[PDB]
């Protein structure tokens, strides 16, 4: 029955999306992904996924509100599930409303309007990839006396998130997700689909695919960065929650399969980290790197002493599977990096 179900995945080349599609194909779903070019789609179909159940459509700019109209006109009677993972390109700008906020909101509104136009009674489930940033501003992320849950919202306004590039990016995620819930509320009787959102913290984990022989490109930066720093190199400053990419992918799939996930914001978060946390874990699990990478200041910079606590009890109860912990993430991520460089 899964092969009788077509799932549309926007932004199919992405880090999260590739794991979603791998998992979907492993469950014998029919998948149409959207890609920015024929060469990317072909590389995906024939070098990465290698499946007759993966098709692709070209969608170049999700800031265009009509970007998904051709897809749903062509396939509007077949797509039962939409996993909307695509985000606008993030680039340096000082015009945050024009270059960040408006494209992010249109990036959500567009595909929903396409569904309303061409597939209102066919699409049964939509899952939108959102962000921890819809739950908190950057300015509210470092309050050890507060608490963030799935019902928390980033409190910034359209105007005050524009003070700086990271805060504006956080605001773009907030307003993009708000647009999804607002669309659903305004169209409750016009469209059939049920909506959930998957809202991840900082994403760690192994690449779905590595092409060998290459400098290795990795989709989550900080672990690969630390692995390649020398002993005396100055340390980056990075603190957030962490979540494995494969758990995010699995959550998206449950979020269209399971009726208990309907209408929920799912906070995809396994634990807190600072760079010290990562160094401690990497040094412990990879003897070959001790004395080669930084040690940092073990015991300093505990994330509990810096970050607003995150309580995602609801999400963990509803998803019903155990998130990978930091040790597993570091083992899988670092061993993939080291083996790939060994092979090249």
Going by C-alpha positions, the residue among 68, 65, 73 that lies closest to residue 84 is 68
The structure was resolved to a resolution in Å of 1.9
Answer yes or no: 98 catalytic.
no
Give the residue numbers of the binding site.
Answer: 15-16, 40, 61-62, 85, 169, 173, 203
All residues at 6 or more sequence positions from 40 whose CB lies less than 8 Å from its CB, including other chains: 13
Q: To 10 degrees, what angle do helices 221-228 and 275-285 make?
A: 60
Alpha-carbon gap, residue 152 to 141, rounded angstroms: 12
Going by C-alpha positions, the residue among 128, 104, 119 that lies closest to residue 251 is 128
173, 186, 214, 258: which is the annotated catalytic residue? 173
Strand locations in 50-179 (E): 54-58, 79-84, 125-129
H or E segment to which residue 23 belongs: helix 15-26
φ, ψ dihedrals at 15, nearest 5°: -60, -55
Angle at 78 between CA 127 and CA 17, to 5 degrees: 35
296: left (phi over 0), alpha (psi -120 to 50) or beta: left
Alpha-carbon gap, residue 216 to 258, rounded angstroms: 37
What's the distance, Cα to Cα, between the start and end of the chain in Å? 41
**Helix, strand, coil content of the chain in percent (nearest 5):** 45, 15, 40
Q: Which two tokens stand for residue 264?
A: 């929920």
* Cβ neighbours of 268 (radius 10 Å): 31
Contact 301, 276 (CB under 8 A): yes
**DSSP code at position 126:** E
All residues at 6 or more sequence positions from 319 whose CB lies less than 8 Å from its CB, including other chains: 250, 251, 254, 261, 266
Alpha-carbon gap, residue 8 to 57, rounded angstroms: 10
Give the residue numbers of the binding site for NADPH.
Answer: 15-16, 40, 61-62, 85, 169, 173, 203
Going by C-alpha positions, the residue among 49, 220, 200, 209 that lies closest to residue 127 is 200
Alpha-carbon gap, residue 100 to 52, rounded angstroms: 36
Contact 275, 236 (CB under 8 A): yes
φ, ψ dihedrals at 179, nearest 5°: -60, -35
Experimental method: X-ray
Going by C-alpha positions, the residue among 274, 277, 258 that lies closest to residue 320 is 258
User: Which residues are 31's β-sheet partners?
Assistant: 7, 54
Contact 303, 237 (CB under 8 A): no
């Amino acid at each position: 029955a899964n092969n009788n179900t077509t799932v549309f995945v926007s932004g199919a080349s992405g880090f999260i999306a590739q794991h979603i599609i791998r998992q979907l194909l492993d469950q014998n779903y029919k998948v149409i992904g959207s890609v920015r070019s024929t060469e990317k789609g072909d590389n995906l179909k024939n070098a990465i996924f290698k499946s007759a159940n993966f098709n692709y459509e070209i969608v170049k700019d999700i800031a265009d509100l009509n970007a998904f109209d051709p897809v749903f006109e062509k396939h509007g009677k077949d797509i039962k599930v939409v996993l909307h993972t695509a985000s606008p390109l993030n680039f340096t700008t000082t015009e945050y409303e024009k270059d960040l906020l408006i494209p992010a909101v249109n990036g959500t509104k567009g595909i929903l309007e396409s569904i309303k136009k061409y597939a209102a009674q066919t699409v049964e489930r939509v899952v939108v990839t959102s962000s921890f940033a819809s739950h908190t501003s950057t300015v509210d992320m470092c309050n050890t006396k507060g608490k963030i849950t799935e019902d928390s919202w980033n409190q910034d306004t359209w105007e005050n998130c524009q003070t700086d590039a990271v805060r504006a990016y956080f605001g773009s995620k907030k307003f993009a997700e708000e647009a999804a819930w607002e669309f659903l509320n305004k169209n409750k009787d016009t469209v059939k689909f049920k909506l959930a959102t998957v809202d991840p913290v900082y994403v760690f984990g192994p690449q779905n695919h590595i092409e060998p022989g290459k400098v290795l490109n990795v989709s989550s930066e900080v672990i690969n960065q630390l692995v390649h720093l020398k002993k005396d190199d100055p340390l980056p400053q990075v603190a957030c929650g962490y979540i494995d990419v494969r758990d995010i992918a699995k959550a998206h799939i449950l979020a269209f399969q399971k009726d208990e996930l309907i209408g929920q914001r799912l906070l995809l978060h396994s634990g807190l980290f600072t760079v010290q946390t990562l160094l401690d874990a990497i040094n412990e699990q990879f003897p070959e790197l001790r004395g080669k990478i930084p040690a940092g200041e073990p015991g300093s910079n505990k994330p509990e002493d810096l970050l607003t606590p995150i309580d995602n009890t609801k999400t963990k109860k509803l998803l019903g599977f155990e998130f990978r912990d930091l040790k597993t993430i570091i083992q899988d991520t670092v061993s993939q990096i080291l083996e790939a460089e060994n092979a090249s």
